[PDB]
Amino acid sequence: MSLYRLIYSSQGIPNLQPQDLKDILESSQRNNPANGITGLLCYSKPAFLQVLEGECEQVNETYHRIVQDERHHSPQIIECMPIRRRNFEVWSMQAITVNDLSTEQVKTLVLKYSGFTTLRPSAMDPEQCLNFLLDIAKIYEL
């Protein structure tokens, strides 16, 4: 019913290739529009960080389906709450890799909101997660 946001992180499996993230993105871009789901996925080997926005029932359907995926494990819900309005509404889904090859502007962003230059969501509170995702969206948009 109500407009909702869910932020979670997970451990990618050890063997993940760049093609595996193309298969996640394409699936998400195929399923998400029809469900009202918008969002952003960050990968920083081996951690995933994703925000999902949408009707509560749809966000939940999508999350609990994602939890069942064989390409990641130990999902940790970081925040889930009703929202006043969407922030990621221009993307059914988008994917960003944050690594050592990343732009200095991007590295300085990871640091602005966390302890290290490599993204580790398990060490960030919901507001730091949301703000990182907002700012990094802002520099890859659209």
**61 part of the interface to ligand FMN, by CB under 6 A:** no
Closest contact distance (angstroms) between CB of 108 and ligand FMN is: 17
Residue bearing tokens 């050890």: 14
User: Residue 5 annotated as binding?
Assistant: no
Chain-centre distance of CA 79, in angstroms? 12
Residues in the chain: 142
User: Residue 114 annotated as binding?
Assistant: no
* Strand 38-44 with 95-97, pairing: parallel
Stretch that binds ligand FMN, among 60-68, 103-111, 114-122, 133-141 (CB under 6 A): 60-68
Dihedral sign for Cα atoms in the order 114, 117, 122, 123? negative
User: Residue 69 annotated as binding?
Assistant: yes
**1 part of the interface to its own copies, by CB under 8 A:** yes
Q: Do 40 and 50 contact (CB within 8 A), yes or no? A: yes
**85 part of the interface to its own copies, by CB under 8 A:** yes
Question: Which residues form the interface with ligand FMN (CB under 6 A)?
Answer: 10, 24, 27-28, 30-32, 37, 39, 41, 48, 50, 52, 62, 65-66, 69, 71-72, 93
